[PDB]
Specification:
Interacts with FMR1. Interacts with FXR1. Interacts with TDRD3. Interacts with HABP4. Interacts with CYFIP2 but not with CYFIP1. Belongs to the FMR1 family. The modification Phosphotyrosine is found at residue 66. The protein has 2 domains: 1-48, SH3 type barrels (Roll), CATH 2.30.30; 49-112, SH3 type barrels (Roll). Helix content is 0%, strand content 49%. It contains no helices and 10 strands.
Amino acid sequence: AYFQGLPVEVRGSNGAFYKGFVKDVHEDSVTIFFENNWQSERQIPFGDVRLPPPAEITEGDEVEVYSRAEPCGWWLARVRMMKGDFYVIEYAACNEIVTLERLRPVNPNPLA
């Protein structure tokens, strides 16, 4: 009851984090719906779950980028260069030019 609809982020097999919402909480996992799929419940172990970030990007900063390699997920990256509103980033999983809507500081929340 208490955790109904809690937003969480879930580690995919690709290392990226995907948004889901809690339905039930068990001793060792949660039942969730992934974002844009309210029909299929999915069970995720706590070691694959973190809370989403609490509610300034400069060159060199570690960031996360919202990308597909699939649904979009948050991927770990670094800002190699910025000029105006263009950001040049490199993925920790592997350059891409993105705008600021695609970026956030690294979620400070650890896996549960």
